[PDB]
RNA sequence: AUAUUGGCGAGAGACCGAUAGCGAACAAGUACAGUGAUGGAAAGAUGAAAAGAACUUUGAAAAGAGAGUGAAAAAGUACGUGAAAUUGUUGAAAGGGAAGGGCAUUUGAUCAGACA
RNA sequence: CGUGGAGGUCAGUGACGAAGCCUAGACCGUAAGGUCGGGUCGAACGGCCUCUAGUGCAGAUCUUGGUGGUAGUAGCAAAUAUUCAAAUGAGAACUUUGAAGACUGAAGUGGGGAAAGGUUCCACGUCAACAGCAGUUGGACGUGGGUUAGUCGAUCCUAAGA
RNA sequence: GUGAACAGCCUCUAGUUGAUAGAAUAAUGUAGAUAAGGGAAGUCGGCAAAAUAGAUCCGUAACUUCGGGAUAAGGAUUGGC
RNA sequence: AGAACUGGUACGGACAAGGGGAAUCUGACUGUCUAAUUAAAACAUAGCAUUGCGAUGGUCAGAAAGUGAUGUUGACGCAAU
RNA sequence: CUAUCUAGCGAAACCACAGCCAAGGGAACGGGCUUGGCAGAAUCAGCGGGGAAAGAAGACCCUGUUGAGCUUGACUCUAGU
């Protein structure tokens, strides 16, 4: 359907911004039913959604 | 359910019509004169080829300053173009005319388009903005299309 | 936990959601016809900027 | 410029709603409505605004009381109950 | 603004109540010519002056 | 006795009939512009009655084609009659750098008198 | 000669179709214009003797309204830039998810405000119009939801002033 | 981070991928460049463009209201390990 | 701050960054204006000079008032140049 | 990046009617009139000769028993004093 509700919610429930939420490309028949907020914490613990790690800006040459 | 000038018998002819269709008018006239007098098999092969970028539609009347292409050579003229919106709006009416032809016993082995015409619909207006703060008009030119199919005989 | 929707009151008093679509389509067509005929007139008498400049002297 | 780049600065209001007439005409930097002078007593009536007298003259609005005096004269301004 | 008075919020309640289509059973009345709702407005086009 | 282009109640017209008559026959001093004083439109007509098209089929649907209502869809809400500029179709005809016009006639179309 | 009305007359015409409208169909008048036949059409309308006038259009950079040619033409070119697979879908250069590629580069294309706007905020449903291409998407469309203060503000002071 | 710098340039947290597109690479264009020899001969006129530039050291004249002129003019250097 | 080292004699290696000089008119300089054709040699300016006026006054406003401005002032002041 | 071609969307200036020229007279520089030379459909990209093409130019000059800004010992007045 249209997951632009859930990718907005998954920054507010996690704490990282919007651009770091990795939703699931295979379970969109299930993520689209997590309308309210307190079902997203039933999915982050399930691993349907994963916070991507911080892109590295090393300082080693500096 | 009044039609235009029809020189055929209205007992062996199915009919089709599309009103207030938001396509161009100067393109639908040219496409609806490309097919006037063709079988409903070669006509649909033609209107499948025009989208497939062979056998272009010739622009006879509404044709000033358009570019030249080679594929109008089979119709004689040298100004040809492929209006892919008006082809899609005419082919639906040909498909509707076949489904009305099959509801009267008219077999599809000898059908041809007898009476086909476009008409300047009521304009649908919008506005555009030019320099120095002046509103000029900016309108669409929709078309009514009428189309009667009938079968060839002796 | 509702037994009341949007449609629950209006299905009883007159209209029906199939005929509501046959009413909603008629207003948006008549809104077009009343907004077409205003732009059929205002485009003529709108370039009359009464304090123009004509910005070309020397 | 004096046109479009000087139309962007228009944000602070200089008229606010009046409490007697109810249109956006109550000036604020000197506190006086322009469709009827509000801290003055009488409404701003004028004879050169002959169309403006029709926009606020009597007979326009509700007349919660003045559309009963015509009927109440015709029965002698009478009192007491109707009948049995 | 977001720091509005009450004179503005008294009026925006009526401005939010007067923004809806005409009720659909009005057109099914007998001597009713009211096709659309003419005084209807939205915030894109016609700013109400307050 | 006199005056009265305001309010209220009446009665009439060698006046106008929707580009007229008040700006307004209609949810008009409304919609709308302007900070504001003020400025201020357009917009009436299905039918006797909605009897506003059940049903079938093509289409994703807008709708189409049947069927049906109707005295009339050449009255289907875009609804009396439907003019012209302008445009499509088919038919007739003509055309070496304009088209149109005047006088005469050939040819092609159509009309004719009865002299039944 | 004609037009809008008014007084007589024709015991005028008319739903078995009155005005109007169309006709390289006909006739009369030098003409102004009158009369007939056909198609459409559906409720009124002429002749003669008179009376009256807001009475005859090609123009007025005429007024209002409508539509042309120009014309599918001018063009839709600032801001570095998009690509692949899948998903719903009638339909996807444009919606979403993933995967890459980028950019803003902390006086930001970020996070909050003040003026001003006023429900655009958010969800569900939907594409006739708008988004100068598209569209299932949207600040659009339809219906509902939402703003919680003893402390943060106004309220209370005084300035220039009124 | 380089840098004296909140310059310019690149990168992280945060955000966006919006501005009609496809093919072709003609003339004329708008923008951005380069050039042999000559160096204003162009033109009303060096208009426009190119040059010089940052830092350190040496080096600085007329005139002067002794404050300036002055970054005057004119020279050399610059990496990495 | 200094020395040996090494190179396609490169080296503020992109980014960033003064063209310079000798004379003449005119304005002293910093600033301001013709928003939307004129940024200047115009205006302003400090400096210099003049005039009125000792308060019941100078200059100016008000239709008038028991009314005002300079004046919460008083010639090293106010007003007009 | 335009332009060119294609998909989609798609206005305006302007317009009596329309466009081959040479001489001729002529409102004194014809697209039409008059003698001539000629003349083949629909046309696309460029172009700036013509259409005395298109614009709410800057003009110089005059008349009007037409105003306004402004100046004085114009005429006739007036606040103030
Ligand atoms: Zn008021």
CATH numbers and ranges of domains, chain A:
3-51 (1.10.1650.10)
Q: Report how far apart the first and last C-alpha atoms of chain A are (Å, whole number).
A: 46
Contact B133, B16 (CB under 8 A): no
- The three-class DSSP label of residue B113 is strand
Q: Which of C23, C30, C36, C42 to mutate to test the interface with E (most CBs of E within 10 A)?
A: C23
- The three-class DSSP label of residue B147 is strand
Q: Do C47 and B135 touch (CB under 8 A)?
A: yes
| CA nearest neighbour of C44 among E21, D34, B127 | B127
Judged on CB neighbours under 10 Å (0-12, 13-18, 19+), B111 is buried
Q: How far is the CA of B44 from the C1' of F111 (A)?
A: 49
| Minimal C-alpha gap between C32 and chain E (Å) | 11
Q: How far is the CA of D59 from the C1' of G5 (A)?
A: 37
The resolution in angstroms reads 3.9
Q: What's the rounded Cα separation, in Å, for the pair B42 and B111?
A: 11
D36 is in an annotated binding site: yes
What is the b/e burial string over B35-50, where b = at least 16 CB atoms within 10 angstroms of the residue's CB? beebbbeebbebbeeb
D15 is in an annotated binding site: no
D17 in contact with chain E, both atoms CB, cutoff 8 A: yes
**How far is the CA of A1 from the CAs of A8, A31, A39, C48, in angstroms?**
15, 10, 18, 51
Q: What's the rounded Cα separation, in Å, for the pair A43 and A50?
A: 9
Q: How far is the CA of D77 from the C1' of F12 (A)?
A: 33
Kindly state the DSSP code that residue B39 receives in the 8-state scheme: B
Chain G: nucleotides below 7 Å from protein CB are 64-68, 70-74, 85, 87-88, 95-99, 113-120, 122-124, 128-133, 137-144, 146, 153, 162
Q: Which of E24, E37, E38 sits opposite C20 (nearest CB)?
A: E24
Contacts of the segment C23-30: beta carbons below 8 A, 24+ positions apart: C23/E24, C23/E27, C24/E21, C24/E24, C26/E35, C27/E21, C27/E22, C27/E35, C27/E36, C27/E37, C30/E35, C30/E36
| CA nearest neighbour of B120 among B142, B135, B153 | B142
């Amino acid at each position: 359907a249209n997951l632009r509700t859930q990718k907005r919610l998954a920054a507010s429930v996690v704490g990282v911004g919007k651009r770091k939420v990795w939703l699931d490309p295979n379970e969109t028949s299930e993520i689209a039913q997590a309308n309210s907020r307190n079902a997203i914490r039933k999915l982050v613990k399930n691993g349907t959604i994963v916070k991507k790690a911080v892109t590295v800006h090393s300082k080693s040459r500096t | 359910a009044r039609y235009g000038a029809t020189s055929t018998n209205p007992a062996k002819s199915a009919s089709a019509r599309g009103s207030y269709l938001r396509v161009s008018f100067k393109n639908t006239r040219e496409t609806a004169q490309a097919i006037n007098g063709w079988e409903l098999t070669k006509a649909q092969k033609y209107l499948e080829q025009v989208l497939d970028h062979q056998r272009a539609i010739p622009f006879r009347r509404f044709n000033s300053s358009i570019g030249r292409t080679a594929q109008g050579k089979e119709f004689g003229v040298t100004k040809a173009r492929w209006p892919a919106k008006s082809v899609k709006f005419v082919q639906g009416l040909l498909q509707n005319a076949a489904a009305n032809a099959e509801a009267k016993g008219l077999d599809a082995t000898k059908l041809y388009v007898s009476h086909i015409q476009v008409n300047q619909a009521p304009k649908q207006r919008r506005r555009t903005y030019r320099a120095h703060g002046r509103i000029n008009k900016y309108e669409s030119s929709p078309s009514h299309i009428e189309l009667v199919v009938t079968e060839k005989e002796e | 936990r509702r037994t009341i929707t949007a449609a629950d009151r209006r299905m009883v008093s007159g209209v029906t959601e199939k005929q509501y679509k046959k009413g909603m389509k008629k207003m948006q067509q008549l809104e077009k016809n009343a907004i077409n005929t205003q732009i059929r007139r205002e485009i003529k008498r709108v370039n009359f900027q009464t304090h123009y400049r004509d910005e070309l002297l020397q | 410029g004096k046109g479009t780049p000087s139309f962007g600065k228009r944000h602070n209001k200089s008229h606010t709603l009046c409490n007697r007439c109810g249109r956006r005409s109550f000036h604020v930097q000197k506190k006086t409505c322009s469709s009827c002078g509000y801290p003055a007593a009488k409404t701003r009536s004028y004879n050169w605004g002959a169309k403006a007298k029709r926009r606020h003259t009597t007979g326009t609005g509700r007349m919660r009381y003045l559309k009963h005096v015509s009927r109440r004269f015709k029965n002698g301004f009478q009192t007491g109950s109707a009948s049995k | 603004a977001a720091q509005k008075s009450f004179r503005i919020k008294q009026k925006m309640a009526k401005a939010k109540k007067q923004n809806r289509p005409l009720p659909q059973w009005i057109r099914l009345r007998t001597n009713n010519t009211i096709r659309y709702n003419a005084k209807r407005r939205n915030w894109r086009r016609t700013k109400m002056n307050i």
